Design a protein around this ligand. Structure first.
Ligand SMILES: [Mg+2]
Ligand SMILES: [Mg+2]
Ligand SMILES: [Mg+2]
Ligand SMILES: [Mg+2]
Length: 49
RNA sequence: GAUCUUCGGAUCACUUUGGUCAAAUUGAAACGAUACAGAGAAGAUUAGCAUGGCCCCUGCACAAGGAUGACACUGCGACAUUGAGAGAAA
């Protein structure tokens, strides 16, 4: 337990240090990812037609 | 027509029309239904003020609210070289 719990906090800390984007960065990129993914299906409909 | 007065002749009164349709689908609000997604500040929860306009609603308002109303970028570069080595073209 004690060896295991030390290794958990050591991995959680590597996440904190790694990313600074915040809520607005993550939600703004998903909007890009949805719009881009939406087109690829929409453009295939144009070639299909 | 009326009043004077020769049956002539006077005199009074003078050009309307507020129209985005000439008869409610195809010429002046959009919202609503549905589907998805589902709320700032570098752990998580959290008050806010501003900031900039081809974004705007509520409001008599130069009060105040509306998520802090919402939305918001950050490669370039006015190009020097040094010294050496290799390559193709004069
Ligand atoms: Mg306000
Ligand atoms: Mg808030
Ligand atoms: Mg409020
Ligand atoms: Mg504001």
């Amino acid at each position: 337990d004690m060896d295991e719990d030390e290794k958990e906090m050591l991995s959680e800390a590597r996440a904190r240090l790694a990313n600074t984007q915040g809520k607005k960065a993550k939600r703004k990129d998903r909007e890009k990812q949805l719009e881009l993914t939406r087109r690829l299906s929409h453009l295939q409909k144009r070639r299909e037609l």
